[PDB]
Write a protein that binds this ligand. Structure first.
Ligand SMILES: Cc1cc(C)c([C@H]2C(C(=O)c3cccs3)=C(O)C(=O)N2c2ccc(CC(=O)O)cc2)cc1C
Length: 123
């Protein structure tokens, strides 16, 4: 049985760079996938998209659109201390949080900073 860690590493292996917004999306997909016992179908959709010739980035976006736990789901809230706990390559993707953010519209997660600041990660 594929674990959350295994799937994260499988997906990371297809991505360029490090700590990018797509890396965080992998984290969110794996976390929510584990919590809903859906790692197997997520892995299968990921591999099927690649086998079709989609880029790995496209494959990850297609997951948020084709795997039902992500359809019209809100991004998860992640509590962090400061903006510096967010990876460097994610910094320019951080945005003010919109009224009703959705994962399948590109809102990966929402960071809640300890001082009350909030930032959404947008792809
Ligand atoms: C709600 C949520 C979502 C995620 C992706 C994580 C990640 C994650 C996170 O992306 C960041 C923390 C500081 C900057 S980004 C972690 O550091 C982390 O360990 N997360 C994570 C990912 C998958 C799982 C599932 C599992 O492997 O059991 C559990 C935790 C933690 C939490 C609490």
């Amino acid at each position: 049985d594929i674990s959350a860690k295994d799937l994260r590493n499988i997906m990371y292996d297809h991505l360029p760079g490090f700590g990018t917004a797509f890396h965080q999306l992998v984290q969110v997909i794996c976390k929510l996938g584990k919590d809903s016992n859906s790692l197997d179908i997520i892995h299968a959709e990921f591999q099927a998209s690649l086998a079709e010739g989609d880029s790995p980035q496209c494959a990850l976006i297609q997951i948020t659109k084709r795997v039902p736990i992500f359809q019209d789901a809100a991004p998860p809230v992640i509590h962090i201390r400061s903006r510096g706990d967010i990876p460097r390559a994610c910094q320019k993707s951080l945005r003010p949080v919109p009224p009703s953010p959705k994962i399948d519209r590109g809102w990966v997660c929402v960071f809640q900073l300890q001082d009350g600041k909030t930032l959404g990660l947008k792809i």
